[PDB]
Swiss-Prot record:
InterPro entries registered for this protein in UniProt: ABC_trnspt_W-bd_WtpA, ModA/WtpA
Lineage: Archaea, Methanobacteriati, Methanobacteriota, Archaeoglobi, Archaeoglobales
Species, as recorded: Archaeoglobus fulgidus (strain ATCC 49558 / DSM 4304 / JCM 9628 / NBRC 100126 / VC-16)
Name of the encoding gene: wtpA
Gene3D superfamilies per UniProt: Periplasmic binding protein-like II (3.40.190.10)
Membrane topology, as annotated: Peripheral membrane protein
UniProt keyword list: Cell membrane, Membrane, Metal-binding, Molybdenum, Signal, Transport
Protein name: Molybdate/tungstate-binding protein WtpA
């Protein structure tokens, strides 16, 4: 039996461990995993005609938003994460950057950075959310302006302390290639930093640690990690090109079994593994703390 599991890119390393654990208990099963940004992952089912047994996203709310009621009808929340700014030892100004000067380093004309496509990937909208929340935290209304809006056609508008970014369609996104690179999913940015095409990238802390990158921790007030800062996070919103609206929220992953799953019984057992104490420990060892 082939169990089809489509998941957020940031779940790639945990999914290797889940596959191994599951196949140990179920010798007649091959877990077939595919990584993509969580919205692109869900569109495999909602637009590209695929059948999946398990969908796992980096933002639990996308399952309800994009799949209910025709393709799914429940979601289980699991795991947390945190946005950081990652780099290599050889990245320009690596020896200088810290939590106080990070946005000044990124503004330098000889520094290149990346983030993923918000239309496809929660890490991408969360990265833009964090940079805009920085304007509030540092009381500096030029950070998003100078890093992103002047280097793209991505812009937040402001009203009484709340901010909204309306995404262009993915084909209409424009980026200044001398400063920024984007990819559909955050995991693709790893290759660009490893090749030297980027100095820095916005990424989850878990992935930075898994892949051995250095990173700067961003303030808890902007990095979407903590339930205790939900009221600050909620001051930013991104309207994705498909019209779905995502608000800044503490990062919480989600899992479901689609209505068209072919292997429902085994899918139930796989979901049980992910959310079990064993699954929580797999995730914790790989850098994602439990709810």
């Amino acid at each position: 039996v082939k169990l089809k599991v489509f998941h957020a890119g940031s779940l790639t390393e945990p999914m290797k461990a889940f596959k191994r654990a599951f196949e140990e208990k179920h010798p007649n099963v091959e877990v077939q995993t595919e990584a993509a940004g969580s919205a692109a992952t869900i569109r495999k089912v909602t637009e590209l005609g695929r059948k999946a047994d398990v969908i796992a996203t980096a933002d639990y709310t996308l399952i309800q938003k994009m799949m209910y009621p025709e393709f799914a009808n429940w979601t289980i929340m699991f795991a947390k994460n945190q946005i950081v700014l990652a780099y290599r030892n050889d990245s320009r100004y690596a020896d200088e950057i810290n939590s106080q000067n990070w946005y000044e380093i990124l503004k330098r004309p000889d520094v290149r950075f990346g983030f993923s496509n918000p239309n496809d990937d929660p890490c991408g909208y969360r990265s833009l959310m964090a940079i805009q929340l920085a304007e509030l935290y540092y009381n500096d209304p030029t950070i998003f302006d100078e890093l992103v809006a002047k280097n793209s056609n991505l812009r937040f508008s402001e009203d009484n302390g709340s901010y909204v970014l309306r995404m262009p369609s993915s084909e209409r996104i424009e980026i200044n290639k001398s400063k920024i690179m984007i990819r559909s999913m955050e995991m693709e940015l790893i290759h660009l930093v490893e090749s030297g095409e980027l100095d820095y990238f916005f990424i989850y802390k878990s992935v930075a640690k898994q892949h051995g990158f250095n990173f700067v921790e961003l303030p808890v007030e902007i990095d979407l990690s903590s339930p205790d800062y939900a009221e600050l996070y909620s001051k930013v919103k991104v309207v994705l090109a498909n019209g779905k609206e995502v608000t800044g929220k503490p990062i919480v992953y989600g899992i479901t079994i689609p209505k068209n799953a072919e292997n429902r019984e085994l899918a139930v057992e796989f979901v049980k593994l992910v959310i079990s104490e064993e699954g929580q420990e797999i995730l914790r060892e790989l850098g994602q703390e439990p709810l």
